[PDB]
Design an enzyme around this catalytic site. Structure first.
Site, PDB file in Angstrom:
ATOM      1  N   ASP A 132     -33.547 -33.551  -8.486  1.00  0.00           N
ATOM      2  CA  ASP A 132     -33.795 -35.003  -8.279  1.00  0.00           C
ATOM      3  C   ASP A 132     -35.040 -35.138  -7.401  1.00  0.00           C
ATOM      4  OD1 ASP A 132     -33.719 -37.826  -7.829  1.00  0.00           O
ATOM      5  OD2 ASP A 132     -31.495 -37.843  -7.683  1.00  0.00           O
ATOM      6  N   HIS A 178     -32.833 -37.078 -11.382  1.00  0.00           N
ATOM      7  CA  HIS A 178     -32.051 -38.293 -11.038  1.00  0.00           C
ATOM      8  C   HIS A 178     -31.162 -38.723 -12.206  1.00  0.00           C
ATOM      9  CE1 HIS A 178     -31.147 -41.441  -8.251  1.00  0.00           C
ATOM     10  NE2 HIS A 178     -31.507 -42.408  -9.103  1.00  0.00           N
ATOM     11  N   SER A 185     -26.973 -43.214  -8.683  1.00  0.00           N
ATOM     12  CA  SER A 185     -28.171 -43.794  -8.017  1.00  0.00           C
ATOM     13  C   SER A 185     -27.722 -44.753  -6.906  1.00  0.00           C
ATOM     14  CB  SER A 185     -29.076 -44.449  -9.027  1.00  0.00           C
ATOM     15  OG  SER A 185     -30.320 -44.786  -8.442  1.00  0.00           O
TER      16      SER A 185
END
Lengths: 805, 808
Positions: free
Chosen positions: B751, B783, B673
């Site tokens: 994602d 994600h 991330s």
């Protein structure tokens, strides 16, 4: 020991500069015109497309009494849109032809009027050619339509008119008076599925047809001009999403992509008639459908391969193929079998009762096979002279080799009441069927190959492997007498030829393993009483021209079947050293990488490999093209299963005859089909191939289209054993546990082999705990256009081999 | 050489290592009772299978987890969820199959929850009686077609409940089976942009709200019992549309998404009122759409997002938290129900029931938080009866503290029929007083499910905070009546997540330390009622108790004199004098702290596996970090990727000086991330420092990220050219290594948070810059990695990339 050769290990900056050193279209689409001036210095004018920037319309002056000049037709001007960014429709037509050349990619010509029509910029343009000397501005044709105008064609009967598709409907316009008219009303994405005049995805990608309409060559007298055209409905065909080139937008595009065992589009042939007066105005238009539904008149038909008209326009015609692509018929469609379509059942049946019981469709030819029906372009109808129909036709199915046949089929009318609906299951009596050429070679009648027929002298000029499958050669044979076949082109070289319509001259773009392409102008001189033995005499040249060429070998198998191959030898070899080997692969059908023609342009990277000391071997295996149906039929129903056996067979053969190959450091690498075989090689023979670099691979057959897979692998319903065996995604357990033995490359924008193929293979690889490397080509579809990626693709290919071979 | 060398394992070898290494009660509800047990604690738990409804029996010692549902599976075929629920599950970052969120009505004892396809429920306690054998959950049938998102019981009457179905509010009756629709914003894809009750993508991902409607707690009677619901009506028409792949991979189709990228149009928003009337038998009679007499966008101009909303306990007002686009100006406003008029077709009908509205009625701007940094949204907003109320306020001092506010409600009287543009503070209440109950260089927790509990009988407000240390959450008690002595209620040395009884007699505390696995201990609060502030927490019973060497927390001061904390995973069997290779693990985004005094073993097991092989693993909370106040978070403002890599180098050179087993010629930056984003900044700004980077789910272009997150920190692209163009790792590819094997990219293909575009676009620019790269796809992963088979692979690739490449 000291025997194993070691490629100089370079830094990645080092490989970029090597590859940057590596990179530091010829005349095509020819129109011959005679000068009609007994006293002037030029006998002809050649029209064509060519480069120095972009492709453009060019001409050469053929003298009466030596390099020709390339005179430009267009007053500078640009046929390329800014930044070479085409329309959505345009860019998707350049992939289905694998067109990579900027500018004018095609044109329509009318010798009578000198009218040149062509798609350019994001619109249409035209010019006229007495005979000019210096260039001229091409007049842009002003429209009031919204989007791009696709597939422009001049009306042969009247050059005052032309046609185009716009929002998947047929339009007609007059170039003199600017008047435009819509002829069909099928459109108004996903909400709109009907289209008219458009060749759908699978028709372009896997049947080599891009146009879906056909001018009537003649007008019938107000005069009236017709157009044959395939109406299409994609309502039941599966819908998939592929990422747009506009990555910033993070959006997709919808497609109609029928996966194998999926509905194809519902199709039909229809007429668009319109009338015109002395002054030229379009006075009226008429949609015309078949008096009986297409699906009931020609049942069992799944794809319309080709279509056209007699030269007189008496009848239309169509090549029709069935689903398993094992059945093919040419049908005569008379313009009267079509009625005006309406919603009033009363009004429609008054047109159906008025269509005379005599008029009917004549199925004039039929081709049956237990392998599959290759679609060949060649179908030449002779004007009916002295109830019958004579025509020439290229028929790979009869003997298992594509050959020419003069055919007469009787046209005896059975008679039918067209008002009452009926369901048949029109086959003409064949009056005779003479073989004009025969043998274990073949006639070229596919992928734009064509014949040229001089009726004055009664001769069919054609293109074949008669001499050798490594060389395309031009041949003339009579269609009266099936006697002597005269070759006009000279051995050593492979030729792509163009004949004048006056059969007095030809051009021949030709090349060899050892020498770059020429484009030579040959005249056909000699006694006019003896035309079959006109001698070709060299008249003029239009083009002459670190590279060590490869050399073609041949070898037989434990089946005694003969295969041919190429080897690039490691540059500056020291006999005694064993070298790391890159096996360059294709292996699909409809391709033949091994032939006597200059390879240095397209396969410049294989020489660059050789220049670092890699052995690059290339082998046409059973399934490859140019060698006839039985040799191509080897793949059918077991893709991936036969092709690797031969590749290992030719690889070991290369190790005996050349003895510079290190069988310990072999690597398999290909794109497209070749990627698919790079991964079958690493499953079934990992003791042979250390590493595999598989590009744009087919990892699941069930995710591929119908038109390609069914012809070869059948329907999933009928051939699971094969679909499963030839699906490299399902055999991922048998891929290596050692890392660095598999590199995956895929063009992220691929709308042909969908990135889902790599995606689903990485999914299966992760499940089975197999390593992998991955490169994405985010601005690239099936082939890699952009030079920037190309360098990168090659720099990666060299580093990956260096470190892990 | 004294340079430690990690053993080089075959690929099968690393798979067998990772496979080796991988071999708590929440949502509590206290209920009172009489025999041997005093209370019954209801909760969600996953006993050593799937998360389910459990209960313990607080007696007068370890509590048994009793089954409340009999042989019931709450998760659909395998983990195959609907598309709407599984995104609801990604936005809450929820990684457990079964019952995740449930609703409870103490008086009637009604439990109500999403399960499998539909809604389920089961009564227990109150007037029904207490169960001893597991109960079978009852199905609530539906004539609706799609899934039913976000169930809630009507607080004022338990016979009724609400749910969203097809972007519209529904209300039903558990007893009668009677359904009824109240909102008609949905009739298709882009052709159906209206919606009511739903909180739009960004609200879910950036402001931590996953519900756009709010029951009135009371009923009124006009002339039939009337029940009200405040709701947010949504119009995503002018919001950009983006296509992310389905998880139906073989389908080869995408899903469209109204994703507002930064500097882009946000959902047009508004608060509407939905009334409905029930009779004696509970039959739904009338139903009424209502809306603000004057459009939402003219009563409250400059309001871009509804952060929060709700009602007062008597229903006299509905309130809302409003926020501007910059997110540097927040408001709390009451909305009197009499401020809402039934929506009508006619110009002439709309001015009639506008004339009809009293001038005395109006919206009242209660509170107005300004800041030069940015407004974090803080959950805590407790109004008392009568307006007096408690509120958490970071902006005021720079730390999140509780305040007791009195607002004066004085009407200016308005002609509601005529069209009205307000002035710069047209509704702001005079603040009569504003006492600070808490103060200091430490924050009250008010985000991400942190909540106060207020005892009105005793005048005490119970909260959790960082008072003792930022490394530990603790339970505190203070008095809103007298801002005096703050008594701590939790043991030090551990960090506590805590939940308080509504009777304020028992509380739970799920807590852990770096060195000790999590416990869930129940505590009673005893002590004479003379003094309620000073009631000692008395340990009552345990619900949970209890290879891995826990890491070591340290602190260091920057050359700017800023105290940063770090963690060290020590190399297992460490020979002093050996210099080992160092995996610097990073996050560095705001709204995240990694360095605290809580067990790290479950989530960061790979960070101990790394340690077992002999890597040093170093974790550093650089500036921008959370749990350290607004000026500390504010360090990233308009400079994301500019301030924290310095801090990651600064804290890395430090760890070298203190411990002296680190080898600075072999360090590797690795994060997912925002961590991925830092990895790539780390390889651009400090390639002398970091020899390899492994970046996961990185943001390469801020111009392709959402508005709520990015505009709150980096501003609009037309107001921070430099900042977007400095902190975009895709724009700085020329500065990535010419050397190969120094950069590994990872990205899941589904994602929907960070779009695969981000990598795809970095790969475009890598190639354009003539730069090498490695890359791994996760085709069944958004994600994060939920499918374990991928997780292990990811880990096995992390060990293999480090071993072959991070060297010399």
């Amino acid at each position: 020991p000291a025997a194993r050769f070691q490629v100089q290990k370079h830094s990645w900056d080092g490989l970029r500069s090597i590859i940057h050193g590596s990179r530091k279209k010829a005349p095509h689409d020819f129109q011959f015109v005679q000068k009609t001036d007994e006293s002037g210095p030029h006998s002809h004018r050649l029209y064509y497309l060519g480069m120095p920037r972009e492709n453009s319309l060019l001409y050469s002056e053929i003298p009466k009494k030596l390099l020709l000049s390339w005179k430009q037709m267009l007053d500078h001007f640009q046929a390329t849109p800014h930044h070479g960014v085409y329309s959505r429709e345009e860019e998707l037509l350049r992939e289905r032809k694998r067109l990579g050349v900027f500018g004018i990619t095609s044109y329509d010509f009318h010798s009578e009027s000198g009218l040149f029509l062509f798609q350019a910029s994001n619109s249409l343009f035209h010019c006229r050619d007495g005979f000019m000397v210096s260039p001229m501005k091409p007049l842009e044709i002003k429209t009031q339509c919204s989007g791009p105008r696709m597939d422009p064609k001049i009306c042969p009967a009247d050059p005052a008119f032309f046609s185009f598709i716009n929002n998947s409907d047929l339009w007609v316009a007059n170039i003199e008076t600017g008047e435009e008219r819509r002829l069909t009303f099928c459109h108004q994405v996903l909400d709109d599925p009907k289209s008219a005049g458009v060749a759908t995805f699978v028709i372009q990608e896997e049947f080599d047809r891009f146009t879906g309409y056909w001018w009537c060559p003649t007008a019938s007298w107000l005069k009236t001009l017709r157009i044959l055209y395939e109406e299409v409905d994609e309502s039941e065909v599966e819908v998939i999403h592929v990422p747009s080139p506009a990555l910033e937008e993070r959006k997709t595009d919808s497609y109609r992509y029928p996966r194998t065992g999926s509905k194809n589009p519902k199709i039909a042939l229809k007429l668009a008639e319109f009338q015109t007066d002395s002054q030229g105005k379009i006075v009226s238009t008429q949609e015309k459908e078949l008096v009986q539904p297409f699906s009931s008149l020609f049942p069992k038909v799944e794809y319309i391969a080709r279509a056209g008209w007699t030269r007189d326009g008496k009848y239309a015609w169509a090549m029709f193929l069935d689903r398993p692509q094992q059945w093919l018929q040419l049908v005569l469609l008379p313009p009267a079998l079509f009625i005006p379509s309406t919603e009033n059942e009363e009004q429609r049946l008054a047109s159906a009762r008025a269509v005379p019981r005599n008029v009917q469709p004549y199925v004039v030819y039929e081709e049956v096979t237990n392998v599959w029906i290759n679609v060949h372009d060649i179908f030449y109808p002779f004007p009916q002279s002295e109830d019958e129909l004579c025509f020439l036709r290229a028929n790979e199915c009869k003997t298992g080799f594509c050959h020419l046949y003069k055919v007469t089929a009787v046209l005896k009318s059975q008679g039918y009441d067209w008002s009452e609906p009926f369901s048949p299951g029109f086959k003409c009596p064949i009056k005779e069927e003479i073989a004009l050429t025969s043998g274990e070679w073949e006639v070229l009648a596919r992928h734009g190959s064509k014949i040229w027929v001089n009726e004055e002298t009664k001769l069919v000029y054609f293109q074949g492997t008669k001499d050798t499958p490594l060389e395309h050669h031009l041949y003339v044979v009579s269609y009266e007498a099936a006697g002597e076949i005269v070759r006009l082109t000279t051995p050593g070289f492979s030729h792509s030829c163009s004949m004048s319509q006056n059969f007095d001259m030809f051009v021949s773009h030709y090349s060899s393993v050892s020498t770059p392409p020429c484009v030579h102008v040959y005249k056909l001189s000699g006694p006019d009483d003896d035309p079959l033995h006109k001698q070709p005499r060299f008249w003029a040249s239009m083009m002459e021209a670190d590279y060590v060429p490869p050399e073609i070998f041949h070898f037989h198998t434990r089946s005694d079947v003969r295969l041919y191959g190429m080897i690039y030898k490691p540059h500056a070899l020291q006999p005694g050293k064993k070298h790391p080997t890159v096996l360059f692969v294709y292996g699909g059908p409809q391709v033949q990488l091994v032939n006597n023609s200059f390879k240095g342009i397209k396969y410049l990277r294989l020489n660059t490999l050789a220049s670092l000391g890699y052995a690059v071997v290339v082998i046409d295996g059973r399934g490859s093209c140019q060698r006839g149906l039985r040799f191509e039929g080897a793949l059918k129903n077991q893709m991936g299963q036969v092709e690797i056996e031969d590749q290992v067979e030719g690889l070991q053969f290369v190790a005996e005859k050349y003895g510079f190959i290190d069988l310990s450091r072999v690597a398999i690498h290909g794109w497209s089909y070749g990627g698919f075989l790079s991964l079958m090689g690493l499953i079934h023979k990992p003791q042979v191939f250390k590493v595999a670099i598989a590009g744009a691979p087919v990892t699941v057959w069930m995710a591929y289209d119908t038109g390609y897979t069914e012809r070869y692998m059948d329907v999933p319903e009928n051939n699971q054993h094969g679909y499963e065996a030839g699906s490299v995604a399902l055999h991922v357990e048998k891929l290596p546990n050692e890392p660095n033995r598999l590199l995956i490359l895929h063009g992220f924008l691929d709308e042909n082999v969908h990135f889902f193929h790599t995606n689903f293979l990485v999914s299966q690889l992760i499940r089975a705990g197999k390593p992998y490397q991955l490169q994405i080509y985010p601005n690239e579809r099936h082939s890699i256009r952009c030079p920037e990626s190309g360098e990168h693709y090659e720099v990666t290919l060299l580093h990956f081999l260096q470190e892990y071979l």
